[PDB]
Write a protein that binds this ligand. Sequence first.
Ligand SMILES: Nc1ncnc2c1ncn2[C@@H]1O[C@H](COP(=O)(O)OC(=O)[C@@H](N)Cc2c[nH]c3ccccc23)[C@@H](O)[C@H]1O
Ligand SMILES: CC(=O)c1ccc2c(c1)CCO2
Lengths: 333, 327
Amino acid sequence: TKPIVFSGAQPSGELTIGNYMGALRQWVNMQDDYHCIYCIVDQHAITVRQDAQKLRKATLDTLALYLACGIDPEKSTIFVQSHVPEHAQLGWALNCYTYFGELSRMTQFKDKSARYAENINAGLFDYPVLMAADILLYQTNLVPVGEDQKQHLELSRDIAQRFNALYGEIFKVPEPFIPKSGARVMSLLEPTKKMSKSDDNRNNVIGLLEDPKSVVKKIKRAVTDSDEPPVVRYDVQNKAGVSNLLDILSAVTGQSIPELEKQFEGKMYGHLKGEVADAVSGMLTELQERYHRFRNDEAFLQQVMKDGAEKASAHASRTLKAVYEAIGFVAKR
Amino acid sequence: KPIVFSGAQPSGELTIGNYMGALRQWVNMQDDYHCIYCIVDQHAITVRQDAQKLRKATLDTLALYLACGIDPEKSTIFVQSHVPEHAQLGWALNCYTYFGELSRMTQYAENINAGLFDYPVLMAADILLYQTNLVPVGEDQKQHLELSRDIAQRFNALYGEIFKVPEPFIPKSGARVMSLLEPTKKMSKSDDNRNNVIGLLEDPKSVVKKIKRAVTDSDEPPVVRYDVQNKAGVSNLLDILSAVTGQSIPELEKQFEGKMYGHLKGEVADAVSGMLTELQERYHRFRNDEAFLQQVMKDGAEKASAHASRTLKAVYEAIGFVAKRHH
Ligand SMILES: Nc1ncnc2c1ncn2[C@@H]1O[C@H](COP(=O)(O)OC(=O)[C@@H](N)Cc2c[nH]c3ccccc23)[C@@H](O)[C@H]1O
Ligand SMILES: CC(=O)c1ccc2c(c1)CCO2
């Protein structure tokens, strides 16, 4: 049997070109090489308060977007997290093998808490433990994520090793799969802050379902630097904006940074922004064309969810049964 | 009938205090209420422990509740982990519980496991799943019941009347059972010193031995009279004897006129062991009938799941999750 790939994305906010290059692009590319399982993590989404109608719509939007990206339900398992009870069941169990201190030191908890001061909830704090359960349920070998999830992923490894040390080879210890390019795509007007899928200022973001004409305008207004003369060179510390544009271009086109720097020799930020705008506009036009075809076919979305939950449940029930036997529960019959 | 929820820890060896207090009280109200007994194995694992002992203790607890007279045809009795909806609802309610509320629980903190921090949310889920009206709580879990009520009202305020707001079951058992070597302190299963307690599985020789050691007083002549302030020990022995036999304190004070504490102790031991005879007979019979315990757990989980699934579906619909597609 093939090694197992697992990853997920939240049906909240609006997925960006950051989410694509950091995760979804890798998801699509791994489907033949590994046994891939992709999850719409609606139980994680509700750690930030959602409108009920928006949550339901976003779950289905996210499914259609996976399909539009090239996630193929004949090759990969695609499912909604809340459809498989074993996620919450294992999450509770792993809560008992996770330390309070490990969770309080998490960067996401701190950042989200600062942002949502009036809803610092226990789910937000416990976020990483449910994420560990998501991964460990499927005997996962590889987890394709962006740089921002590295810390959560490291806890999942710690939990698996801790549990295995007491009980035997119950879990696989998963490894991160973080790409070379596009692992941390930055905001267009604040290039020292990563691109957010729920940014208050939409001008920071390239949304995957956003009007391409609007995206082209946003790229043209992206902040660069005061260098005289302007030079197109990758340098995160001194040229955050220009570097972010190069990273985006590289990730869309497949061209390396040295190749792009050569291409832009004797050229300035007009040429750079023109190429980024054209590459991104084309990608989004094609993606959105596929998206609407999937999004408006409710019978197909319903079948994909049904088949995916069924396949996921088979894997998940097996791991949970072994966990419950190990920790000492009376088995259900 | 109102729905009553009780969580049973698969860990405590129950005492005569537990039995003649709350358990006997509740055994006789199984047709008055819809009583639910949940053996809380998911709560147990917040404290690291031996796995085979936990499995054993789960079955020990099931057999003992059955032996004490919990009727699986009248009441619902099940193992918590057999009903996935507990964990499912628990996660959901985690997202409507303030971090501050959990840190403000009465209970450095860096090395506690997250389960020990977060278990009040699972407790709330346990209760709210079954549209519970009444929860018998000890003083130690009043804060936890209040959190469950706050969560229920908060969720209901956002989404409609999804949950019943549970109430404490106020009226208490009436049987008084204090510690044998410290009669000011209540006989508790959680006591470190086990000579303070009489467990439900103790044989007659162990009961005689523990009751012989029970503290009395230096009154001369010895006098068997009820006086909690001056004669805590003798009073405790009278309350225990009264709880077992149903004889009043005045009747027993008359029965032991001119008698010494040796006679009192002898009668208490005989009365207690007489009560524990039918109980232990039932226990050892039920505990060693694997098929009977299996059927009780299966039937109980089925009844509980039917109720829990309806609540969870309403919760999930309210939050806005896409409904599972069944095959
Ligand atoms: N600016 C950016 N540049 C590059 N990559 C980025 C950027 N912003 C986000 N990402 C990545 O996108 C993926 C989905 O993010 P979410 O916030 O939906 O979702 C998250 O952040 C996960 N916790 C969801 C999850 C739940 N359970 C799991 C189990 C395995 C893997 C992932 C999960 C992520 O890989 C994230 O790293
Ligand atoms: C019962 C409960 O409170 C709970 C359930 C699932 C879960 C957590 C908590 C933390 C990670 O996943």
